[PDB]
Amino acid sequence: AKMAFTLADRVTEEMLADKAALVVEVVEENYHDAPIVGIAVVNEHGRFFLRPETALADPQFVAWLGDETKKKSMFDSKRAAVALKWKGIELCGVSFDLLLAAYLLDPAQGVDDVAAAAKMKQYEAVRPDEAVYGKGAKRAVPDEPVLAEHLVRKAAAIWELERPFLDELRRNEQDRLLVELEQPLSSILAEMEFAGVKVDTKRLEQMGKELAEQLGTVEQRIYELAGQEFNINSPKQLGVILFEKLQLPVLKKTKTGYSTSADVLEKLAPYHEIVENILHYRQLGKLQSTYIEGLLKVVRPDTKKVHTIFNQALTQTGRLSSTEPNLQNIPIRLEEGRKIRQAFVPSESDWLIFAADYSQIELRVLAHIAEDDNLMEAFRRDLDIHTKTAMDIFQVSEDEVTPNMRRQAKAVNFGIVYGISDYGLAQNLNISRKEAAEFIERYFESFPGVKRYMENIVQEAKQKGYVTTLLHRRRYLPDITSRNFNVRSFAERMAMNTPIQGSAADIIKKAMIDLNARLKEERLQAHLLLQVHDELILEAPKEEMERLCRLVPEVMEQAVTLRVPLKVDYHYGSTWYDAK
DNA sequence: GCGATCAGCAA
DNA sequence: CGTGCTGATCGC
């Protein structure tokens, strides 16, 4: 049942038609400066396989790749675009990306290869990538005959599936979401990843040295207090020392033993001096292992840059994720960890880091969608939302809001932004589930529009089977009808929350597209480096800061027009740490 | 080697 | 009893 195709030794004119399904295969998970193992082209003239060395050296093929008027349909075009950028080759004209199309149709499917996307439309004349390349240590590129047939079958699937996928997207009112938002964003993320972020490795190595010393000191103190040496990083061995040898009370249990999480340890500190030391050890160790050694492992020795990969087709909220390295969770809340950011510096001499972030975009989105009079007024006055929330739920005047009250209201707001349960809020505030539920009840009394929205969206999710965001992103919630309380409750919370987090994701994605267009019109050298959910990090010549102070916030604030204003704060400095 | 476990970081 | 990511430990 083999598929017919030409194993070309050279490029020909019919291979350069104005429309084609194109496969530029990069097997390595991390595609930065990675090998392209094969190329496949399927168009009106037939199916072809090309060896990279040949195609990529052919002037006509390269010109075809870079010609925006020659339309290509692909799967994960960002992967191909970046691998080509490392080879100094520009990829243009990608009018359809099957990975992004599948992602928008149903992000829950977890489509990660052509075969998975194809199976959505009952097309199975293509093998999963894992079946062809294997996994782990067994991972390997097969012989040419096997490789060629696979790439051709993937190209063939893309060629056949474009129409049905576009048709369904159109029915879902998601055609513009793909063509005007996700696909243009894919090219921007490609530029960001390729640019990378410069790292001051010397600074990082010096911090590591200092941490190594502090860890050694705390480590010995721990053994001294424990009366014996053991593996501190082993919750198992640690649990024995704490709850058996030292007899500390067991306040929480894990699936396999005693809980030793920070929240638990904090409660045990008063009982024994070893506890504070364990917490200190955990803090230093986390910075050392994850943020010092971890970062140093992925920095490119020649340029001293790290090149993350943004996964644009994973979350059911529409948010982006970051890997190898993950640059969306670099420490900032605790000063010792925050210092790690001093190691992230501008890539050019006399350039600076510029960071802009939306102020409470999620709650502003909620005010808009729920049309809650109180919440909308709060943002129209640009009030400190935590103080305002405290005033309302605790029924007091602004001057009567104490620090503890604001902290708890802030936690309630966090819970609303991330859609946590009463149990989750209770754990975050170290209170009972009942008291946490009471806080939520008071919040609904103060913001009846939000309560009405939460009730209505849950009913809508049950009726339609899904919920949608501002720009029509969709999330199916089959568990909304489950007779299992916990399972159904999570689905209900996601029905309430996805439109909030998801719309915020839509907005910043559009802002990135609008920003790049403006930077180009203005002829600025400034460029995006990272996205951290509601923040955008750029670098630019020091001479462009003043213009950026006005341009970036404006473009981000005007990305969409809501019933309440959008507000963006910004800072810049010599390092990411200083961009505060 | 590799998956399960537990831990902790960010918006 | 939000998510996604990475790292240390540990049994098969």
Ligand SMILES: OC[C@H]1O[C@@](CO)(O[C@H]2O[C@H](CO)[C@@H](O)[C@H](O)[C@H]2O)[C@@H](O)[C@@H]1O
């Ligand atoms: O010196 C290494 C040796 O010490 C043990 C404890 O007996 O573990 C310590 O060192 C590890 C590496 O720094 C940490 O992960 C661990 O938390 C700390 O207690 C042994 O496991 C190890 O062989």
